[PDB]
């Protein structure tokens, strides 16, 4: 059983039952975010961000409240800087909203920009508290524009994180099986992690039914892009009243998903080795995860290597069970690679930086087989 890594045995890395409402003191922030599709189109979003007061973060006591306040402020920032999403970029964030978002981001050890942990892990709720977690029974908390498939893009992303929750709980079982030298306990525990990663691929299939190719490329992808190496903000975003210099921060990508790196590290796949772009990007995106997940990924690399344990015993039965988890990963990297073609490459032709990246993390996964 995992410790104070804020990993839930039911939903995994996602926030378990996230809050929907801040205290009534923060009605100004909750109002702008809950009506984002209308204020962006009406042109008064950026006005209502300017006619704001500099509120205090101190009223955010419990954990679930600060995450939402990062979630509400993260969406406003992406909506403010990008506007309707056609070129009118605001290279300055106003102080009455820049310094409260930077205070809370420094609080949660997160960057002051919308990340995967905000719009996926803490951005959901159950329609019926008695009916189980499925797409038809769950809904998002915030969106960008009308018909952007942000419900489908985020809930399907979240749905696969819940399938991995049934595999992360097996990690302590594997690590103590190696310590106690119990082979059968390790063989089944490896088979179980593989099997849950097999079920997680079927959850990935749902993305076609709830997300549209060009509705994602044109509407949602524009607001999720950040300002690190982005040409529209050559130096980044100035946080007025917090940093005198413009600060470069990466946007949101699947690399910030903790299950992305969770099993690469466990199975001994040195995805962060070498000076490659994928190995550097996977290490840089750890700073964009919650602090509890930064240390959980850290604790796995500290624990003994599971790969060398199987490669040493000369046990073909263990070699086949371990190879099943690697094959389950390749099946996901090969499906994730397919989704990017239908959703980025072909829309972009009426783009390839994510393509060349995701081919390398899969290529490394195939080279791990025995
Ligand atoms: C639906 C897609 C998405 O990119 N969602 C998204 C993007 C940006 C933002 Cl900001 C928020 C959500 C994909 C989901 C599940 C993915 N995944 C998790 N563990 C994986 C292990 C693997 F081997 C693998 F190949 C993919 C794996 C990550 C994203």
From Swiss-Prot:
Its main location: cytoplasm. Belongs to the indoleamine 2,3-dioxygenase family. The lineage of its organism: Eukaryota, Metazoa, Chordata, Craniata, Vertebrata. Heme b binds at residue 336. One of its GO terms (biological process) is female pregnancy. This is Indoleamine 2,3-dioxygenase 1. The keyword Heme applies. Keywords: Cytoplasm, Dioxygenase, Heme, Immunity, Iron, Metal-binding, Oxidoreductase, Tryptophan catabolism. IDO1 is the target for therapy in a range of clinical settings, including cancer, chronic infections, autoimmune and allergic syndromes, and transplantation. Its EC number is 1.13.11.52. Its cofactor is heme b. One of its GO terms (cellular component) is smooth muscle contractile fiber. InterPro entries: Indolamine_dOase, Trp/Indoleamine_2_3_dOase-like.
């Amino acid at each position: 059983i995992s410790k104070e890594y804020h990993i839930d045995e039911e939903v995994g890395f996602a926030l378990p039952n996230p809050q929907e409402n801040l205290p009534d003191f923060y009605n100004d922030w909750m109002f702008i975010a809950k009506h984002l599709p209308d204020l962006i189109e009406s042109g008064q979003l950026r006005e209502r961000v300017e006619k704001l007061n500099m509120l205090s973060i101190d009223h955010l006591t419990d954990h679930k409240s600060q995450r939402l306040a990062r979630l509400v402020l993260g969406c406003i920032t992406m909506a403010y800087v990008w506007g309707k999403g056609h070129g009118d970029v605001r290279k300055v964030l106003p102080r009455n909203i820049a310094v409260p978002y930077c205070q809370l981001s420094k609080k949660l050890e997160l960057p002051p920009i919308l990340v995967y942990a905000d719009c996926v892990l803490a951005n959901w709720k159950k329609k019926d508290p008695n009916k189980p977690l499925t797409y038809e029974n769950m809904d998002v908390l915030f969106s960008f524009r009308d018909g952007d498939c942000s419900k489908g893009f985020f809930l399907v992303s979240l749905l696969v994180e819940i399938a991995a929750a049934s595999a992360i709980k097996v990690i302590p079982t594997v690590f103590k099986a190696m310590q106690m030298q119990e082979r059968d306990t390790l063989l089944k525990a490896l088979l179980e992690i593989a099997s849950c990663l097999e079920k997680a691929l079927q959850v990935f299939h749902q993305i076609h039914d709830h997300v549209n190719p060009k509705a994602f490329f044109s509407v949602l992808r524009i607001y999720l892009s950040g300002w690190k190496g982005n040409p529209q903000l050559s130096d980044g975003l100035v946080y007025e009243g917090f940093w005198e210099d413009p600060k470069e921060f990466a946007g949101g990508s699947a690399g910030q998903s903790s299950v992305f790196q969770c099993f690469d590290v466990l199975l001994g796949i040195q995805q962060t080795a070498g000076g490659g772009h994928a190995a550097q990007f996977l290490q840089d995106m750890r700073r964009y995860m919650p602090p509890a997940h930064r240390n959980f990924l850290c604790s796995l690399e500290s624990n003994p290597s599971v790969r060398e344990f199987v490669l040493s015993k000369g046990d073909a039965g263990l070699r086949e069970a371990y190879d099943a988890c690697v094959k389950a990963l390749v099946s996901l990297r090969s499906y994730h690679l397919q989704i990017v073609t239908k959703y980025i490459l072909i829309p972009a032709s009426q783009g390839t930086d994510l393509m060349n990246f995701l081919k390398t993390v899969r290529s490394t996964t195939e080279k791990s087989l025995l």
